[PDB]
Paper text:
The second structure is the KATP channel in complex with ATPγS alone, which is solved to 4.4 Å resolution (abbreviated, ATP state). Therefore, we applied ATPγS, a slowly hydrolyzable and functional ATP analog, to stabilize the structures of the KATP channel with and without GBM. The overall KATP channel structure and SUR1 conformation in the ATP + GBM state is almost identical to that in the ATP state based on our density maps. In contrast, this density is not present in the ATP state, where GBM was not supplied into the sample. Therefore, we compared the density maps around lasso motif between the ATP state and the ATP + GBM state, and found that the extra density near the lasso motif in the previous medium resolution map is present in both states. With improved resolution and map quality, we found that this extra density was contributed by both the M5-Lh1 loop and an unknown ligand, probably a lipid head group that constitutively binds KATP, because it is also present in the Mg-ADP state described later. We observed a similar density in the map of the ATP state structure. In the sample preparation procedure, we added 2 mmol/L ethylenediaminetetraacetic acid (EDTA) to avoid the activation effect of ATPγS by chelating divalent ions. Therefore, we observed an Mg-independent ATP binding site in the degenerate site on the NBD1 of SUR1. We observed ATP density only in the NBD1 degenerate site but not in the NBD2 consensus site, which suggests that the degenerate site has a higher affinity for Mg-free ATP, and ATP alone is not able to drive the dimerization of SUR1 NBDs.
ATP-sensitive potassium channels (KATP) are ion channels that selectively allow potassium ions to permeate the cell. Specifically, they are inhibited by ATP and activated by Mg-ADP. Previous studies have established that the functional KATP channel is a hetero-octamer composed of four inward-rectifying potassium channel 6 (Kir6) subunits and four sulfonylurea receptor (SUR) regulatory subunits. KATP channels in pancreatic islets are composed of Kir6.2 channel subunits and SUR1 regulatory subunits.
Author numbering:
A (entry chain C), D (entry chain A): 32 to 356
B (entry chain B): 996 to 1040, 1060 to 1286
C (entry chain B): 24 to 52, 63 to 96, 103 to 160, 167 to 277, 283 to 329, 354 to 406, 411 to 566, 571 to 616
C-alpha cells in the first residue's frame, strides 16, 4: 500500500495542480542552493563563461570599430595595445575580468570608451563573484547529511511496563558531534470519520513523548529507547493486536529536530512505521555494557529482539481488565 | 626471574667447572669466527700454506666443541646430584608441625617434577642458549669488523629489538600459563564422564555435557591459537629487522669495501 | 620523442597522488567489508612493487632525471592505491572505486603508447609486465563494479558486513583483515600493547570465529566420514581426514616449497655480487633484500596455516571421540586410562604430526636443490661434501632413538622414587615421633643414585647430539676445501658453499624428528581407529 | 567507576561496531570543519599545493609538446612567451592560478589549447577558493569555546528549604557577553529494573527545574543557584543519605543550552555529578555583596561551603515524617 513518508526521510506525497505564480523561480538563489553539486557547479561555470564571452565579444567589437584592429604602423595607438584577433581579445577579457591582470596588452588613456567598458566590466565581475561565493557558502551549510547519520531501528515493539501497555523505539547518534536540544514530535495518521459524517483521508494527531514532569525534547548520547505510555485518553488506545499486522492502515511517524553544534543549523529526521512493520510483545536486548573502564555500546544488537511472555490483548480490553484487575 | 636462582644453580657446580665451561665456549666461538676470517685472506690469490692453516683451524674447532659438550654434561649431572641430596637433607630436619601445615601435593610435587624437569631439560636448553647468544654476538662483531661504518648503523636497529623484547615476554609468559589452565579441567572432565557413564546416560544429560565439552575445547583452542599467533608475530618482526641489517650491510660493503676500501675479502664475511 | 612519452607517463601518477591527499588527510585526521578480488588486488600490487624496483634499477643503469621518474612516480601511485583500498575496506563507497578506475585506464593508455613506440624501433620485458599487471587490476575493478554498485542499477544489494568475524565481541580476527596483515600479523600490535599493561585473561581474550570451532570442524570431519563410510577402518579414517582438511594443508605446503626455493636462491646472488666486485651489484643487493623478506614471510605464513589446520584437526577428532564415548558399552579402569591417554598423548601426537606434515613434503626438494646447486659451484668435490652433511641425518635419528630408550628406563626409576616419598610426606607426625626419618632418607638416597646413573648415559647422548650439530658444518668445509684444491677458488665459491652448508644444515635436523613423529602418528591413528570402532 | 560524561563536557561512552555506510566522509566539509586548526590548515595548504602542482605539470607538458620548449630563435612564437624550464612553468602556474598575474611570461593568441587550459584553470581555482573560504568561515563560528567559559561548582549540596528537601547547584558566566534564552535540562541516570523483569543498563529521567509558574529556562547575569524541590513524585525521592557517598551509582547531569549573542549559534554545556561527588546538609556562602555603588561578585567563595544543622534522613522517610510532622 501507499506510504506517507519514506524510510530514508524523504516525503512521498506527490503534489498535483500547483498554481505556480512564479515564486518557484522568484527564490532565485534559495532555489539553486538546494540543488545537487554537479548542477550547481554546472550553472556556476555557465554564469562565469557567459559573462566572459559577453565582454570578450564587446571588446573584440570595440577594437574592430576604433580601427585599431586594422594592423597599421603609426598614426594611431590602439585603445588596447597589442590586440590582433578575437583570440587575443578573449584573452584580454579573461585577463581583466577574473583579475589576473597579465599586462601584455595595455588599455590606454586615448579612448574613454574603453575606460567605460572596463569600469562596468569590473563591477559586474565583482558582483557576480560576490554572489557566487555567498551562495556556495550558504550551500556548504547543508547539514541534511547530518540528518543522514541518525538512525532508527527498523521496526518498533510494544511491551508492558509498570502494569500499563507501552511502546518502545530506538534512536541513536553516529558521530562524536552532538545535536543540541533535539525534540521529538511523534504523530499518528489514519483515515478518520467523524461522528458528524465527515471523513478525512488522513488525520495527524500528536501522541505524547513521556519524559519527566513534562517537556517535548530529549538528550542523545547513547541509544535511548523512547518511552510512551498509551492510556485511555491516547488516540492509539483503541486498536487490537491481531488486526494490526495485515489489514489496518496506521502510519506512526517520528520527527526528531535539533541543531547541530558546528554549523548551528537546525536539522531534523523523519521516519514512518507501518501497520505491517510494527510487532507485538517483545523486548530489545541491552546495548550498553560496563566495559573495562567505560560504557561500550554494541550496535550489532541494535535491531535485535527477544521474546517476552506478556499477555496479548487490546488496549481497550486491557484497560477494562485493569479495571477488573 | 632474577639472576639469583641461576647464580645459586651455577654455584652449586662450583668454581671448578664454571670457568671451564665459559672460557671454553668463548674460545670455541672465537675459533669458529677466526676460521672464516682466515678463509677471507685465503680467497684472493702461498695457496698450500693457506690450506694447511685452514686445516689446523678446522681441527681446533671440533676438538674444542667436544670439550665444551663434555663439560656441560658433567656439570649438569653434578649439579643435579648435589641439589637432590641437599633437598632431601633439608626436608629431613623439618619440624612436625611444618609437615602437617603444608599439603602433601606441593612437597611431593617438587621431587616428582622439578627434579625430573631439571634433569631432562636444563642442560640441553642451557647449552642451546649459550651457543645461540655467543653465535649472535660473534656475528655482530664480524659484520662490524668487516664494515667499520656498518657497525654504527646496526646499533640503532638492535635497540629496536629491546622494545620488541619486553612487550613480547610480558605476554608470551601470560598466554603460556593460560594454555596450561585450559588443558587441566578438559582432561579431568573426560575422566568424570567415563566413570559415571551409566548415571549420565540414565539422566539423559548427554546434551548438556557435550555442550560443556565444546565450551572447554573452544577455551583450549583460543589459547593454543593466540600463543602461536604471538610467536608468529615476534618471528616475523625479528626477521624483518634481520633482513634490514643484511640490506644495510651489503649496501655499505659494495661501496666502502670496493670503491675506496678496495678490499674484496671483507664483503664475503659480512654478507654471509 | 622519448622524453615526451616519459612525461606523459608521469602525468597520471601525479593526478592520482594529488586526488588521494585530501581524502587521505580527512581519513587520517568497526565493520570490515571485503570485495571480490581483494587478495588478487594485493598480490598484483606486490608484483607491481617488484616490477617498479626493476624499473628503478634500469633507470640507475641508464643514467637524465625525466627518463627514470616514471618508476618513482608509479611507486607512490601504487602505495597510494593501497592507501585508497585500505580506506575503502574500512568504509565502503561507490565513488572512490571509480576514482581508482580512472587512473588505471589512463596508466594503461600511456603504457600502450610506450609499447607501440618501442615496437617501431631490457626495457621491453618490464614495460610488458607492467601492462599485463595494470590490465588485470583493471579487470578486477570491472568485476567490482559488476558485483555491487559502481553505476549498475539503483541498489547494490550490498552484502551486510560479515557478522561471523565482526559481530559481538571477538578478539582473534585472523580471517577478517587485510591480506598484508594476514602475512605480517599487524593486527597483533594492539593486542600485545594492551597486554603489556593489563593482565590477559579469558574475559580479556576473544572468542573463536565461526570458521574454527568444535562444531565446524566436527561437521566437516563427520561429513567426510559419512561420504566415505556410505561407500563401504584405518585407511578409511585417514582418507576421511585428508579429504576433510583438504585445501589448507596443500596451500601451506606450496607456500613452504616456494619459500624453500627462494632460500636456496639467496646465496647465488651473494655469489654473483662477490664475483662482480672482484673483477650490476646494487641491483643484486636490493634483489637479495626483497628475496629474503619474501622468502621468510612465505615461510611464516606456511607455518601458521599448518598450525591452524592442526588445531582444527585436534578439536575435531577430540569432540568426535567424545561423541563416541556416549554410545560405548559398559563391558569395555584400564580402558579409562587408555581413553585419557588417547586424548593426552595420542591426539597431541596426531596434531604435531599435522604440524610437521608440510615439512615432510618440502624437505626432499630442499636437499635436492641444495646438492645440485653446490655441485655446479664446486664441481665433483662438492659431491663429496654433499655426502658428509647428508650422512648426519640418519645418524641423528639413531642418536634420537637411543635417547628415547634411556628416557624410558629413567622414567621407571623416577616413578618408584615418588612412591617412596608419598609415604614420608604423609606419616609426618608418625615419622618424627620416633625420629626414624633418617632411616627412610637413606633409602630415598639409595633410589636417587640409580636415577643419577641413568641420567649419565642420557646426557652423554645429548652431548653427542650437540657435538655433531656443530661438528658436521666444520667437517664439511674441511674435507671439501682440502679435498677440492689440494686434491683434485675465488672467494665467491667458498663463501657460497659456506652459506649453502648452513642453509642445508638447518633443515637436516628436522627430518629425523619428522620421521619419528610420522611413525608415532601412524601408530596413534591405528589406536584411535581401534578405539573409535568398538 | 565509569562516568557517563566527563566534567569538561566531553562525552565518555566509546562507540563500538558502527555499521559505517560512508556517511562519515559523505559530510565532506561538515566533517573537516569539525577538526582542529593544525589539521584544517594542513589540509587547506595541501589542497592548494595539490592543484597548483597539477596544473604546473600540465603546463610544463603542453609547452614541451608544442615544441616552444625547445630553445629556438624565429619560425615560432611560444604559446607562453619566455618559458624555459619546469621552474619557470611552475612560476607561471602560481602566477595565473592565485591571480597575482606577473605578466613576465605571456600566454599568446597563437595556441587555443593554452586558452582552454587557462579557462579551466581559473574556474577550478575560483571554485576551490570559494569553498576554502566558506568552510573556514563556517569554522570561525565554533563557539564551543564559549561553552568552555561557563563554569559549574565542583560538587552540589542539598538542603531543607520551606520545610521540604532541596538540592542546590551553582552556575555562572565568565564574560560580559550574555547567552540568550539559556534553558536547563536536568537529568538523572541509573541502572533500573522494571517490575516486568526488564533491566536497563542506564535510564535517563527528567528532574524538573523549579522556576516560577513553569518554564524550562533561566536568565544568567550573576551566579544563580538552581533550585529544585524533590517531592514524592520525583524519581530521586527514594534514596538514602548514608548510601549515596560510597556504594550507589547515580550520575546527575545538567545540560544548559543557549545561543550566544554575537555569533548567533546555539551552544550548550554538559556536566555530571557522581554519587561520591555530591554531599549532604550544607549551604553555600553568599557571593553577591552590596559594594560601593554596585554589586560585587567574589568568585573565591564560589565553591565555598558552610555547615548547617539540618536533619539527616531519607527523602521517603522525611516525607513520612512530614506526614507525621
Ligand atoms: N491550486 C493552487 N496552487 C497553489 N496556490 C494556490 C492555488 N489556488 C490558490 N492558491 C493561492 O493560495 C490561496 C488559496 O486561496 P484560494 O483557494 O485560491 O481562494 P480564492 O478566493 O479563489 O483566491 P484566488 O484563487 O487567488 S481569487 C490563494 O490566495 C492563492 O494565491
Ligand atoms: N551496527 C550499525 N551501525 C550503524 N548503523 C546501523 C547498524 N545497523 C543498522 N544500522 C542502520 O540503522 C538502521 C537500524 O535498523 P537495523 O537494526 O539494521 O534493522 P534491519 O532490518 O536489519 O535493517 P538493515 O540492517 O539495513 S537490512 C538500519 O536501517 C541501518 O541502516
Amino acid at each position: 500500500r501507499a506510504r506517507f513518508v519514506s524510510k530514508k526521510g524523504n516525503c512521498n506525497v506527490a503534489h498535483k495542480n500547483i498554481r505556480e505564480q512564479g515564486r518557484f523561480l522568484q527564490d532565485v538563489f534559495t532555489t539553486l542552493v538546494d540543488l545537487k553539486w554537479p548542477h550547481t557547479l554546472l550553472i556556476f561555470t555557465m554564469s562565469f563563461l557567459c559573462s566572459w564571452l559577453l565582454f570578450a565579444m564587446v571588446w573584440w567589437l570595440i577594437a574592430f570599430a576604433h580601427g585599431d584592429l586594422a594592423p597599421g604602423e603609426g598614426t594611431n595607438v590602439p585603445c588596447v595595445t597589442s590586440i590582433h584577433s578575437f583570440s587575443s581579445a578573449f584573452l584580454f577579457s579573461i585577463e581583466v575580468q577574473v583579475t589576473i591582470g597579465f599586462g601584455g596588452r595595455m588599455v590606454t588613456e586615448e579612448c574613454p570608451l574603453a575606460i567605460l567598458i572596463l569600469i562596468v566590466q569590473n563591477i559586474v565581475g565583482l558582483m557576480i563573484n560576490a554572489i557566487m561565493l555567498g551562495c556556495i557558502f550558504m550551500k556548504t551549510a547543508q547539514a541534511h547529511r547530518r540528518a543522514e547519520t541518525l538512525i532508527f531501528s527498523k521496526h518498533a515493539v510494544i511491551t508492558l511496563r509498570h502494569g500499563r501497555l507501552c511502546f518502545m523505539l530506538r534512536v541513536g547518534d553516529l558521530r562524536k558531534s552532538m545535536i543540541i536540544s533535539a525534540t521529538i514530535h511523534m504523530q499518528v495518521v489514519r483515515k478518520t470519520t467523524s461522528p458528524e459524517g465527515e471523513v478525512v483521508p488522513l488525520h495527524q494527531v500528536d501522541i505524547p513523548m513521556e519524559n519527566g514532569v513534562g517537556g517535548n525534547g530529549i538528550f542523545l548520547v547513547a541509544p535511548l529507547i523512547i518511552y510512551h505510555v498509551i492510556d485511555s485518553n491516547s488516540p492509539l488506545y483503541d486498536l487490537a493486536p491481531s488486526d494490526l499486522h495485515h489489514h489496518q492502515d496506521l502510519e506512526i511517524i517520528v520527527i526528531l529536530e535539533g541543531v547541530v553544534e558546528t554549523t548551528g543549523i537546525t536539522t531534523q529526521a523523519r521516519t514512518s512505521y507501518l501497520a505491517d512493520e510494527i510487532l507485538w510483545g517483545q523486548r530489545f536486548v541491552p546495548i550498553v555494557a560496563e566495559e573495562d573502564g567505560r560504557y561500550s555500546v554494541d550496535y550489532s544488537k541494535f535491531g535485535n529482539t527477544i521474546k517476552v511472555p506478556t499477555p496479548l490483548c487490546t488496549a481497550r480490553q486491557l484497560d477494562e481488565d485493569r479495571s477488573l484487575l | 626471574i632474577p639472576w639469583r636462582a641461576c647464580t645459586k644453580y651455577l654455584s652449586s657446580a662450583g668454581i671448578l667447572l664454571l670457568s671451564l665451561l665459559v672460557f671454553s665456549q668463548l674460545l670455541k666461538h672465537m675459533v669458529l669466527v677466526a676460521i672464516d676470517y682466515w678463509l677471507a685472506k685465503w680467497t684472493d690469490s702461498d695457496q698450500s700454506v693457506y690450506a694447511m692453516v685452514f686445516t689446523l683451524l678446522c681441527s681446533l674447532g671440533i676438538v674444542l666443541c667436544l670439550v665444551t659438550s663434555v663439560t656441560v654434561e658433567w656439570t649438569g649431572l653434578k649439579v643435579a646430584k648435589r641439589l637432590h641430596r641437599s633437598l632431601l637433607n633439608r626436608i629431613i630436619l623439618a619440624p612436625m608441625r611444618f609437615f602437617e601445615t603444608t599439603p602433601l601435593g606441593s612437597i611431593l610435587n617438587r621431587f616428582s617434577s622439578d627434579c625430573n624437569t631439571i634433569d631432562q631439560h636444563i642442560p640441553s636448553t642451557l647449552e642451546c642458549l649459550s651457543r645461540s647468544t655467543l653465535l649472535c654476538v660473534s656475528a655482530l662483531t664480524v659484520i662490524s669488523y668487516v664494515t667499520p661504518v656498518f657497525l654504527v648503523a646496526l646499533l640503532p636497529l638492535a635497540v629496536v629489538c629491546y622494545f620488541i623484547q619486553k612487550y613480547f615476554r610480558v605476554a608470551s609468559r601470560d598466554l603460556q600459563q593460560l594454555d596450561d589452565t585450559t588443558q587441566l579441567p578438559l582432561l579431568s572432565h573426560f575422566a568424570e564422564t567415563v566413570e559415571g557413564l551409566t548415571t549420565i546416560r540414565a539422566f539423559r544429560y548427554e546434551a548438556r555435557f557435550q555442550q560443556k565439552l565444546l565450551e572447554y575445547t573452544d577455551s583450549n583452542n583460543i589459547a593454543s591459537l593466540f600463543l602461536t599467533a604471538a610467536n608468529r608475530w615476534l618471528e616475523v618482526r625479528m626477521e624483518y629487522i634481520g633482513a634490514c641489517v643484511v640490506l644495510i650491510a651489503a649496501a655499505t660493503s659494495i661501496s666502502n669495501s670496493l670503491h675506496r676500501e678496495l678490499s674484496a675479502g671483507l664483503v664475503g664475511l659480512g654478507l654471509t | 620523442n622519448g622524453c615526451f612519452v616519459d612525461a606523459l607517463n608521469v602525468v597520471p601518477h601525479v593526478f592520482l597522488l594529488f586526488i588521494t591527499f585530501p581524502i587521505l588527510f580527512i581519513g587520517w585526521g568497526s565493520t570490515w567489508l571485503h570485495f571480490p578480488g581483494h587478495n588478487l588486488r594485493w598480490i598484483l600490487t606486490f608484483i607491481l612493487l617488484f616490477v617498479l624496483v626493476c624499473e628503478i634499477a634500469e633507470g640507475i643503469l641508464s643514467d637524465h632525471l625525466h627518463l627514470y621518474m616514471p618508476a618513482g612516480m608509479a611507486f607512490m601511485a601504487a602505495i597510494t592505491s593501497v592507501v585508497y583500498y585500505h580506506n575503502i575496506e574500512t568504509s565502503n563507497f561507490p565513488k572512490l572505486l571509480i576514482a581508482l578506475l580512472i587512473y588505471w585506464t589512463l596508466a594503461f593508455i600511456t603504457k600502450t603508447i610506450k609499447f607501440v613506440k618501442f615496437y617501431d624501433h631490457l626495457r621491453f620485458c618490464l614495460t610488458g609486465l607492467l601492462v599485463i599487471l595494470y590490465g588485470m587490476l583493471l579487470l578486477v575493478e570491472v568485476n567490482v563494479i559488476r558485483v555491487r554498485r559502481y553505476i549498475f542499477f539503483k541498489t547494490p544489494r550490498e552484502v551486510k558486513p560479515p557478522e561471523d568475524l565482526q559481530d559481538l565481541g571477538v578478539r582473534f580476527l585472523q580471517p577478517f583483515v587485510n591480506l598484508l596483515s594476514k602475512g605480517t600479523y599487524w593486527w597483533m600490535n594492539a593486542f600485545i600493547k594492551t597486554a603489556h599493561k593489563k593482565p590477559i585473561d579469558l574475559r580479556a581474550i576473544g572468542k573463536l570465529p565461526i570458521a574454527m570451532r568444535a562444531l565446524t570442524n566436527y561437521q566437516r570431519l563427520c561429513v567426510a566420514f559419512d561420504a566415505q563410510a556410505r561407500k563401504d577402518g584405518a585407511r578409511a579414517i585417514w582418507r576421511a581426514l585428508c579429504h576433510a582438511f583438504g585445501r589448507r594443508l596443500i596451500l601451506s605446503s606450496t607456500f613452504r616449497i616456494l619459500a624453500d626455493l627462494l632460500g636456496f636462491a639467496g646465496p647465488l646472488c651473494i655469489f654473483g655480487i662477490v664475483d662482480h666486485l672482484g673483477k650490476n651489484a646494487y641491483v643484486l643487493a636490493v634483489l637479495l633484500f626483497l628475496a629474503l623478506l619474501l622468502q621468510r614471510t612465505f615461510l611464516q605464513a606456511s607455518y601458521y596455516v599448518a598450525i591452524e589446520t592442526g588445531i582444527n584437526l585436534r578439536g575435531a577428532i577430540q569432540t568426535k571421540i567424545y561423541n563416541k564415548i556416549m554410545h560405548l558399552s559398559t563391558s569395555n579402569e584400564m580402558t579409562a586410562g587408555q581413553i585419557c591417554n588417547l586424548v593426552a598423548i595420542d591426539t597431541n601426537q596426531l596434531m604435531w604430526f599435522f604440524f610437521l606434515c608440510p615439512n615432510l613434503w618440502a624437505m626432499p626438494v630442499q636437499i635436492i636443490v641444495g646438492v645440485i646447486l653446490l655441485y655446479y659451484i664446486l664441481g665433483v668435490s662438492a659431491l663429496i661434501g654433499a655426502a658428509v652433511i647428508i650422512l648426519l641425518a640418519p645418524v641423528q635419528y639413531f642418536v634420537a632413538t637411543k635417547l628415547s630408550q634411556a628416557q624410558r628406563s629413567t622414567l621407571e626409576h623416577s616413578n618408584e622414587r615418588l612412591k617412596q616419598t608419598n609415604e614420608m610426606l604423609r606419616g609426618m607426625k608418625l615419622l618424627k615421633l620416633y625420629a626414624w626419618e633418617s632411616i627412610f632418607c637413606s633409602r630415598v638416597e639409595v633410589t636417587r643414585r640409580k636415577e643419577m646413573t641413568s641420567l649419565r648415559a642420557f646426557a652423554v647422548y645429548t652431548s653427542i647430539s650437540i657435538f655433531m650439530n656443530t661438528a658436521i658444518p666444520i667437517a664439511a668445509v674441511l674435507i671439501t676445501f682440502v679435498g677440492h684444491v689440494s686434491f683434485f677458488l675465488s672467494p665467491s665459491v667458498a663463501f657460497a658453499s659456506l652459506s649453502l652448508f648452513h642453509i642445508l644444515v638447518t633443515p637436516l635436523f628436522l627430518l629425523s624428528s619428522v620421521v619419528r613423529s610420522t611413525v608415532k602418528a601412524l601408530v596413534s591413528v591405528q589406536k584411535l581407529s581401534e578405539f573409535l570402532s568398538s
